[PDB]
Design a protein around this ligand. Structure first.
Ligand code: HEM
Ligand code: HEM
Ligand code: HEM
Ligand code: HEM
Lengths: 146, 141, 141, 146
């Protein structure tokens, strides 16, 4: 996808404020809480019986950190998301067989998490810029299905 | 189907939103139009610019329909029947679009409810909006 | 919500399918596994090859659940309650997958019902399978 | 997407048997009957009040013929669907703003129409080959959104 300079500005400015040790875990956790079927892919993560257990689960936090790292890598290569996500696409599609709709869902949860954290700062135009980004990452991660 | 805990969570978010519900409905629409441009096709006769009195008025209508659904949560099919007819029969609103607005409504609540928007309440709100959407697309003939 | 005409159309397709329903359920599963490989992840312990007695047996189960839904079309939520619990709670079946199997079920009926599968009956069957799917994903907690 | 020789064989063999003056209209008609909201984009087509009216509507049949032509063009360039569909993508996305989910829906209706017409000949493996094709056309037609 192609972001305009204003959208790239909106995205980059906000991202520099993100706590990269926490936001990933918050997004992954909520994905598992809000869309329970996604828990199917994390049988080894332990206690996921309640929202509190999921959010405080050390493995969820650690894994979310890895997911966020990937979004950061994409934010750094917005004009080549496909190349950036090629390896993760093989993993999520060819090996894990995660339905691509869940890539869209995680991106949207991330958007909800950013809105929660930044409040009024996460304006409608800023959200729009971020939707282009998560749509881009989701499409890149799903390339192997195409 | 909404659980007792979901109904409680939704009612509580509703209460916290309070009198801002109308303004928040407008904000959610604005976020939807900017984020998902395809949705604008349904409002050709609306000025969709920021500050538009039309978007403001419509946001209040959307908000009122949602509060009617939460106030009659045990029988939304009945409460939202007329709106279901309008969106499906007259407007021909693509079902995918309900997911887009529901997401923008969640984003709006999240940007306005620091304490309320916990993962559990987030899940309850998502279920509620999904329930509302199910009713509004149930009239496809 | 299913109309009188839809219920009539579905009952008629059901009647024409007759005793082949079980075989057709298996065929729909096979088409789903070949066409949408991601769905195979839910059946790791099944031999999914053509002619598999496991797929054959399961097809009969799927068929029986669908006929139970058509026989209690006015109250599928109740009739399909136990299956909804199983698919959501225990199996964690991704909601998108119900659309995939519903499409394969339609394709199977189309390949077996030259006269029945008119555009109107096609629409009724689609609504029915969508209704069934709505119930089977209504238990997400 | 990439079809194997066996899948390309399954597809090509069946397609040579398709009546190209009728199948498009049948698919478009059913799309309008089964997914009523799609009628929103065809206000000028006239009587679409009943299934029979839609199926017998001359404009629906004529337009469906054009749609089928495009699928034929794609079947002829399976390894370059994007280039083949670039112009239609601008039209359907940038100008018409049709949600891409409907591209998937039309492809699936086409599959139902082919199953209806060929019966037992439209085997599970043949359907699988066709799903790769309609998924490919839908993804190509949606490229402008990506
Ligand atoms: C927005 C899309 C997503 C991104 C950017 C992403 C990113 C990542 C990253 C960076 C890893 C670690 C790979 C490594 O250890 O080398 C990974 C692993 C994994 N992801 Fe995701 N992911 C996404 C969505 C999903 C979804 C939606 C699911 C399932 C509901 C999923 C399930 C997994 C699992 C099960 C692993 C562990 C793989 C293993 O270690 O064997 N991912 N993901
Ligand atoms: C949470 C879901 C939604 C709710 C609660 C909702 C509610 C409403 C309400 C209360 C009205 C006014 C009804 C009247 O005047 O009688 C309305 C009208 C309308 N809605 Fe929605 N709606 C929803 C989703 C959608 C979506 C997703 C679209 C399209 C993308 C849409 C498009 C419209 C349009 C075009 C009108 C008529 C506008 C006009 O001419 O004034 N709605 N909606
Ligand atoms: C039209 C929709 C569907 C119907 C009517 C249906 C019906 C059934 C029935 C009757 C059973 C047996 C229940 C029992 O043993 O108590 C079952 C089990 C199961 N279903 Fe479904 N199902 C549907 C869709 C799906 C989908 C979309 C998936 C996954 C892609 C799925 C995956 C499974 C699995 C994995 C089992 C358990 C298999 C086993 O261990 O024996 N079902 N289903
Ligand atoms: C599988 C995807 C589809 C293909 C291959 C396709 C193909 C075509 C073709 C070849 C044309 C004629 C362009 C011309 O006259 O030069 C066209 C036009 C059009 N299509 Fe589609 N189409 C598809 C899906 C859709 C869907 C899902 C909708 C709406 C529900 C849609 C709405 C239209 C409309 C409104 C036109 C007329 C445009 C005009 O003449 O101004 N199309 N399409």
């Amino acid at each position: 996808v192609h972001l305009t300079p204003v959208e790239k500005s909106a995205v980059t400015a906000l991202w520099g404020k993100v706590n990269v040790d926490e936001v990933g875990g918050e997004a992954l956790g909520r994905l598992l809480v809000v869309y329970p079927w996604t828990q199917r892919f994390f049988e080894s993560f332990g206690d996921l019986s309640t929202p509190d257990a999921v959010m405080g689960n050390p493995k969820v936090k650690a894994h979310g950190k890895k997911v966020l790292g990937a979004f950061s890598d994409g934010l750094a290569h917005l004009d080549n998301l496909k190349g950036t996500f090629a390896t993760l696409s093989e993993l999520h599609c060819d090996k894990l067989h995660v339905d691509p709709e869940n890539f869209r869902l995680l991106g949207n949860v991330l958007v909800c998490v950013l809105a929660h954290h930044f409040g009024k700062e996460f304006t409608p135009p800023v959200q729009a810029a971020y939707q282009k980004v998560v749509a881009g990452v989701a499409n890149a991660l799903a390339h192997k299905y195409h | 189907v909404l659980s007792p805990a979901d109904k409680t969570n939704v009612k509580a978010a509703w209460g916290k939103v309070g009198a801002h519900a109308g303004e928040y409905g407008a904000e959610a629409l604005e976020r939807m139009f900017l984020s998902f441009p395809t949705t604008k096709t349904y409002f050709p006769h609306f000025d969709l610019s920021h500050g538009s009195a039309q978007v403001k008025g419509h946001g209040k209508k959307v908000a009122d329909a949602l509060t009617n659904a939460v106030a009659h949560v045990d029988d939304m099919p009945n409460a939202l029947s007329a709106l279901s007819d309008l969106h499906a029969h007259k407007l021909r609103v693509d079902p995918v679009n309900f997911k887009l607005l529901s997401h923008c409504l969640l984003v709006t609540l999240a940007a306005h409810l620091p304490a309320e928007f916990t993962p559990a309440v987030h899940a309850s709100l998502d279920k509620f909006l999904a329930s509302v959407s199910t009713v509004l697309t149930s009239k496809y003939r």
